Amino acid sequence: IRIFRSELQRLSHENNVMLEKIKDNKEKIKNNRQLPYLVANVVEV
Amino acid sequence: LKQTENDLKDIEARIKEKAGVKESDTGLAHPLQVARCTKIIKGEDAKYVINLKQIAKFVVGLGERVSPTDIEEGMRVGVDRSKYNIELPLPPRIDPSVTMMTVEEKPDVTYSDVGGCKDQIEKLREVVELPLLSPER
Numbered sequence: 001i002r003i004f005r006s007e008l009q010r011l012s013h014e015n016n017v018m019l020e021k022i023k024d025n026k027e028k029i030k031n032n033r034q035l036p037y038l039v040a041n042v043v044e045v
Numbered sequence: 046l047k048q049t050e051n052d053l054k055d056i057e058a059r060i061k062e063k064a065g066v067k068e069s070d071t072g073l074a075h076p077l078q079v080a081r082c083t084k085i086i087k088g089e090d091a092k093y094v095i096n097l098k099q100i101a102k103f104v105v106g107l108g109e110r111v112s113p114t115d116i117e118e119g120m121r122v123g124v125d126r127s128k129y130n131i132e133l134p135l136p137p138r139i140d141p142s143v144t145m146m147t148v149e150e151k152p153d154v155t156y157s158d159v160g161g162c163k164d165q166i167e168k169l170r171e172v173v174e175l176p177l178l179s180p181e182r
Contacts, residue, residue: 019064034088034106035088035090035103035105036084036088036092036094037095039101039102039103039114
């Protein structure tokens with residue numbers, strides 16, 4: 001019952017820690033994700 | 046010695062010609078066979094980088110927006126292989142590739158046989174000259 005007080009504040013503070021980390025690690029990835037790269041072909045599953 | 050002193054103003058203007066090259070200085074240094082650039086550093090989707098050659102064949106499904114701001118890098122982007130249209134940023138597209146074309150100027154030929162060509166030449170005039178006079182008809 002009383003756990004939800006500090007649990008809701010902790011889970012909401014992790015939005016930038018978990019979800020936004022996908023786009024936070026893209027700082028150096030997006031520059032590589034930009035079209036000026038070398039393409040490839042997948043020859044094996 | 047005209048060419049000797051012509052380069053005096055040309056070499057000084059070569060830097061002015063290089064000023065247009067100063068836009069993209071990467072990759073060292075309009076008819077084209079196939080569209081080719083170096084890495085296309087300039088460039089839904091924002092940037093557009095496509096090249097067809099023995100190395101790094103590229104393809105993009107989207108387009109028709111301004112990434113590059115007109116010419117970029119190798120300056121050759123546009124129609125080749127068909128299938129490929131970069132239009133929106135002032136294209137150098139649909140341009141003659143390496144080929145053999147015979148183009149001359151003023152093929153001057155006077156009248157030869159008017160005997161049976163009286164109304165026969167008029168049929169030739171109705172081909173080319175006719176739409177160039179009164180197209181409203």
